[PDB]
Design an enzyme around this catalytic site. Structure first.
Site, PDB file in Angstrom:
ATOM      1  N   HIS A  64      30.228  20.075  65.102  1.00 50.84           N
ATOM      2  CA  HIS A  64      30.485  20.141  66.770  1.00 50.84           C
ATOM      3  C   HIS A  64      28.761  20.886  66.769  1.00 50.84           C
ATOM      4  O   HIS A  64      28.573  21.447  66.755  1.00 50.84           O
ATOM      5  CB  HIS A  64      30.894  21.112  66.373  1.00 50.84           C
ATOM      6  CG  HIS A  64      32.755  21.227  66.592  1.00 50.84           C
ATOM      7  ND1 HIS A  64      33.729  21.091  66.000  1.00 50.84           N
ATOM      8  CD2 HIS A  64      33.023  19.937  66.389  1.00 50.84           C
ATOM      9  CE1 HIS A  64      34.774  20.864  65.303  1.00 50.84           C
ATOM     10  NE2 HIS A  64      34.903  20.192  66.413  1.00 50.84           N
ATOM     11  N   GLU A  67      27.919  24.487  68.101  1.00 54.13           N
ATOM     12  CA  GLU A  67      26.966  25.205  67.095  1.00 54.13           C
ATOM     13  C   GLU A  67      26.360  25.335  66.329  1.00 54.13           C
ATOM     14  O   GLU A  67      25.747  25.046  65.086  1.00 54.13           O
ATOM     15  CB  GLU A  67      28.875  24.682  65.891  1.00 54.13           C
ATOM     16  CG  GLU A  67      30.317  25.246  66.630  1.00 54.13           C
ATOM     17  CD  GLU A  67      31.314  24.736  66.352  1.00 54.13           C
ATOM     18  OE1 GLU A  67      31.010  24.493  65.316  1.00 54.13           O
ATOM     19  OE2 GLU A  67      32.220  25.005  66.630  1.00 54.13           O
ATOM     20  N   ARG A 122      30.704  19.656  73.028  1.00 55.48           N
ATOM     21  CA  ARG A 122      31.354  19.909  71.137  1.00 55.48           C
ATOM     22  C   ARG A 122      31.661  18.338  70.514  1.00 55.48           C
ATOM     23  O   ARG A 122      31.634  18.558  69.811  1.00 55.48           O
ATOM     24  CB  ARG A 122      32.772  20.876  71.189  1.00 55.48           C
ATOM     25  CG  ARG A 122      33.820  20.552  70.395  1.00 55.48           C
ATOM     26  CD  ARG A 122      34.824  20.439  70.655  1.00 55.48           C
ATOM     27  NE  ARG A 122      36.703  20.645  69.510  1.00 55.48           N
ATOM     28  CZ  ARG A 122      36.549  21.515  68.584  1.00 55.48           C
ATOM     29  NH1 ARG A 122      35.237  23.163  68.595  1.00 55.48           N
ATOM     30  NH2 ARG A 122      37.227  21.080  67.433  1.00 55.48           N
ATOM     31  N   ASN A 139      36.515  16.417  64.099  1.00 51.66           N
ATOM     32  CA  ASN A 139      36.875  17.004  63.067  1.00 51.66           C
ATOM     33  C   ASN A 139      37.930  17.276  63.678  1.00 51.66           C
ATOM     34  O   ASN A 139      39.291  17.555  62.846  1.00 51.66           O
ATOM     35  CB  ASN A 139      36.299  18.861  62.858  1.00 51.66           C
ATOM     36  CG  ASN A 139      36.702  18.712  61.610  1.00 51.66           C
ATOM     37  OD1 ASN A 139      36.643  18.484  60.261  1.00 51.66           O
ATOM     38  ND2 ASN A 139      36.491  20.391  61.488  1.00 51.66           N
ATOM     39  N   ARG A 140      38.529  16.284  64.637  1.00 50.07           N
ATOM     40  CA  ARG A 140      39.685  15.967  64.757  1.00 50.07           C
ATOM     41  C   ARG A 140      40.001  14.477  64.394  1.00 50.07           C
ATOM     42  O   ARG A 140      41.050  13.401  64.523  1.00 50.07           O
ATOM     43  CB  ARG A 140      40.383  16.056  66.087  1.00 50.07           C
ATOM     44  CG  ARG A 140      40.906  17.571  66.120  1.00 50.07           C
ATOM     45  CD  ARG A 140      41.784  18.950  65.162  1.00 50.07           C
ATOM     46  NE  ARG A 140      40.954  19.480  65.621  1.00 50.07           N
ATOM     47  CZ  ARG A 140      40.117  20.808  65.881  1.00 50.07           C
ATOM     48  NH1 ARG A 140      39.524  19.985  64.890  1.00 50.07           N
ATOM     49  NH2 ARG A 140      39.971  22.221  66.452  1.00 50.07           N
ATOM     50  N   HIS A 192      30.525  25.483  60.201  1.00 54.80           N
ATOM     51  CA  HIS A 192      30.749  25.353  61.818  1.00 54.80           C
ATOM     52  C   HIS A 192      30.241  27.043  62.519  1.00 54.80           C
ATOM     53  O   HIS A 192      29.813  27.758  61.191  1.00 54.80           O
ATOM     54  CB  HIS A 192      31.963  25.257  61.612  1.00 54.80           C
ATOM     55  CG  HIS A 192      32.445  24.054  61.733  1.00 54.80           C
ATOM     56  ND1 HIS A 192      32.913  23.268  62.612  1.00 54.80           N
ATOM     57  CD2 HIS A 192      32.809  23.401  60.139  1.00 54.80           C
ATOM     58  CE1 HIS A 192      34.024  21.518  61.933  1.00 54.80           C
ATOM     59  NE2 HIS A 192      32.826  22.052  60.517  1.00 54.80           N
ATOM     60  N   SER A 193      30.886  26.618  63.552  1.00 55.99           N
ATOM     61  CA  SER A 193      30.969  28.386  64.135  1.00 55.99           C
ATOM     62  C   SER A 193      31.284  28.576  65.435  1.00 55.99           C
ATOM     63  O   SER A 193      32.410  27.338  65.600  1.00 55.99           O
ATOM     64  CB  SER A 193      29.154  28.702  64.400  1.00 55.99           C
ATOM     65  OG  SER A 193      28.901  28.093  65.810  1.00 55.99           O
ATOM     66  N   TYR A 194      31.736  29.790  65.339  1.00 55.82           N
ATOM     67  CA  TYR A 194      32.181  31.325  65.257  1.00 55.82           C
ATOM     68  C   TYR A 194      33.311  31.294  64.918  1.00 55.82           C
ATOM     69  O   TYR A 194      34.298  30.621  64.660  1.00 55.82           O
ATOM     70  CB  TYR A 194      31.544  32.146  66.117  1.00 55.82           C
ATOM     71  CG  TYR A 194      32.598  32.584  67.838  1.00 55.82           C
ATOM     72  CD1 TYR A 194      33.070  32.997  67.776  1.00 55.82           C
ATOM     73  CD2 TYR A 194      32.116  30.739  68.787  1.00 55.82           C
ATOM     74  CE1 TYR A 194      34.043  32.918  69.265  1.00 55.82           C
ATOM     75  CE2 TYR A 194      33.552  31.218  69.670  1.00 55.82           C
ATOM     76  CZ  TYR A 194      33.697  31.986  69.470  1.00 55.82           C
ATOM     77  OH  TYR A 194      34.755  32.277  71.025  1.00 55.82           O
ATOM     78  N   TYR A 244      45.036  28.189  63.515  1.00 52.53           N
ATOM     79  CA  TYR A 244      46.616  27.475  63.852  1.00 52.53           C
ATOM     80  C   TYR A 244      46.525  25.648  64.116  1.00 52.53           C
ATOM     81  O   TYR A 244      45.193  25.635  63.108  1.00 52.53           O
ATOM     82  CB  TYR A 244      46.999  27.276  65.697  1.00 52.53           C
ATOM     83  CG  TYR A 244      47.300  28.553  66.319  1.00 52.53           C
ATOM     84  CD1 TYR A 244      48.093  29.326  65.488  1.00 52.53           C
ATOM     85  CD2 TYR A 244      46.691  29.896  66.721  1.00 52.53           C
ATOM     86  CE1 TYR A 244      48.942  30.191  66.730  1.00 52.53           C
ATOM     87  CE2 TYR A 244      46.997  30.709  67.101  1.00 52.53           C
ATOM     88  CZ  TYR A 244      48.385  31.247  66.991  1.00 52.53           C
ATOM     89  OH  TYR A 244      48.619  32.727  67.185  1.00 52.53           O
ATOM     90  N   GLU A 266      33.018  28.971  59.190  1.00 54.84           N
ATOM     91  CA  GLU A 266      32.581  29.614  60.861  1.00 54.84           C
ATOM     92  C   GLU A 266      31.880  30.799  60.735  1.00 54.84           C
ATOM     93  O   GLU A 266      31.736  32.151  60.262  1.00 54.84           O
ATOM     94  CB  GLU A 266      34.204  29.876  60.933  1.00 54.84           C
ATOM     95  CG  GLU A 266      34.764  28.651  61.096  1.00 54.84           C
ATOM     96  CD  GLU A 266      36.342  27.744  61.464  1.00 54.84           C
ATOM     97  OE1 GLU A 266      36.039  29.388  62.977  1.00 54.84           O
ATOM     98  OE2 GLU A 266      36.864  28.154  61.406  1.00 54.84           O
TER      99      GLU A 266
HETATM  100  C1  LIG Z   1      35.580  29.809  68.100  1.00 46.39           C
HETATM  101  C2  LIG Z   1      35.713  28.711  66.378  1.00 46.39           C
HETATM  102  C3  LIG Z   1      35.787  27.419  66.660  1.00 46.39           C
HETATM  103  N1  LIG Z   1      36.182  26.470  65.578  1.00 46.39           N
HETATM  104  C4  LIG Z   1      34.843  25.851  66.027  1.00 46.39           C
HETATM  105  N2  LIG Z   1      35.117  25.433  65.084  1.00 46.39           N
HETATM  106  C5  LIG Z   1      35.548  25.016  63.905  1.00 46.39           C
HETATM  107  C6  LIG Z   1      36.129  24.824  63.010  1.00 46.39           C
HETATM  108  C7  LIG Z   1      37.203  24.168  62.746  1.00 46.39           C
HETATM  109  C8  LIG Z   1      38.246  24.186  60.826  1.00 46.39           C
HETATM  110  C9  LIG Z   1      39.328  23.484  61.108  1.00 46.39           C
HETATM  111  C10 LIG Z   1      39.644  23.180  60.350  1.00 46.39           C
HETATM  112  N3  LIG Z   1      39.221  21.727  59.678  1.00 46.39           N
HETATM  113  C11 LIG Z   1      38.428  23.061  63.846  1.00 46.39           C
HETATM  114  O1  LIG Z   1      37.738  22.002  63.658  1.00 46.39           O
HETATM  115  O2  LIG Z   1      39.211  23.375  64.605  1.00 46.39           O
HETATM  116  C12 LIG Z   1      36.602  26.324  64.867  1.00 46.39           C
HETATM  117 ZN   LIG Z   2      33.048  23.688  65.305  1.00 49.38          ZN
END
Ligand SMILES: CCCn1cnc(C[C@H](CCCN)C(=O)O)c1
Ligand SMILES: [Zn+2]
Ligand SMILES: [Zn+2]
Length: 304
Positions: A64, A67, A122, A139-140, A192-194, A244, A266
């Protein structure tokens, strides 16, 4: 010039992947696993003392674009490997017994875009048919409950899963690399973050992995280890009870390939700065995160 305590643009990261490799030939080799939508080489560093039939841990950062602390962390991990090999027992055991595939920036095109045009980008930067909206959420985009709950069908959304699983060159390249090296990769770590959490599978459905108990106790222990340095508080768990839905993730896909230790990290913060984490926190964030990553590494090494 490159600094490990600053956010580096792609040109600088790319130059660093070449220089860190040439400066450390007996510990690092560099390959390009594919190219991005915009034609950039997706570099991969293989960190470890070369040896016969070694198990490996795969780590990626920068899925992303916004991040930025994730990209910084992959670089810090290499920094640490180079700096402490021979100077500290654990790291040299790690590099002698395991190889670490470190992919510092997967979504290079998006990352460049966060430096040139939009700090809050992103997704990838690929084109979508029938709209001018750009990009797919990498990541989708994996074949793990692909495009079900938590992944949008709208190309203008930040969670768009793409035209098809592995539609993105970047995700296809990553998945191809992992499928081709499945017999040696024992763990999959994706940074990843946050929000300060350690997640593990499942996020594409409300179900728990067969080794849920093991993964939960490992995540709990890695969170505790991370907290020892500065008291930073992480939460953890399977996606099903922690977040979620977020179908099409690489962690879930890697796990369904048979990689039993599959974790999403994260990193800092909890939302004060969010994605715009100050450069003054890079060092502390990376140092505490190293403790969790090394904890997981050590565990994997003992569970081969
Ligand atoms: C504020 C934080 C948001 N945030 C950013 N990046 C992620 C990584 C998740 C991982 C889900 C499990 N594959 C995602 O892709 O939703 C979360
Ligand atoms: Zn991410
Ligand atoms: Zn350190």
């Amino acid at each position: 010039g490159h600094s490990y305590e600053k956010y580096n643009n792609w040109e600088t990261i790319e130059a660093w992947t070449k220089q860190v490799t040439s400066e450390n030939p007996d510990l690092i080799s560099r390959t390009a696993i594919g190219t991005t939508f915009l034609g950039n080489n997706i570099y991969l560093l293989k960190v470890g003392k070369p040896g016969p039939n070694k198990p490996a841990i795969f780590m990626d950062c920068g899925f992303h674009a916004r991040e930025w602390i994730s990209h910084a962390f992959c670089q810090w991990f290499v920094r640490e490997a180079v700096l402490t090999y021979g100077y500290e027992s654990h790291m040299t055991e790690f590099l002698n017994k395991l190889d670490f595939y470190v992919l510092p920036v997967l979504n290079i095109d998006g990352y460049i875009y966060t430096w040139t045009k939009n700090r809050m980008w992103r997704k990838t930067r690929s084109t979508n048919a029938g709209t001018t909206c750009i990009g797919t959420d990498p990541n989708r985009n994996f074949d793990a409950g692909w495009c079900t709950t938590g992944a949008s069908t709208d190309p203008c959304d930040e969670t768009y899963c793409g035209s098809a699983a592995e539609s993105e060159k970047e995700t296809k390249a990553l998945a191809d690399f992992i499928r081709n090296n499945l017999s040696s990769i024992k763990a999959y770590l994706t940074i990843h973050s946050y929000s300060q959490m350690i997640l593990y599978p499942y996020s594409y459905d409300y179900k728990l992995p067969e080794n849920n108990a093991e993964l939960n106790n490992l995540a709990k222990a890695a969170v505790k280890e991370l907290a020892t340095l500065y008291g930073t508080k992480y939460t953890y768990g399977p996606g099903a009870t922690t977040i979620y839905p977020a179908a099409g993730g690489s962690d879930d896909w890697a796990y369904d390939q048979g990689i039993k230790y599959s974790f999403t990290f994260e990193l800092r913060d909890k939302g004060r700065y969010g994605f715009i984490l100050p450069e003054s926190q890079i060092q502390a964030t990376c140092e505490e995160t190293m403790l969790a990553i090394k904890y997981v590494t050590n565990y994997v090494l003992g569970h081969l």
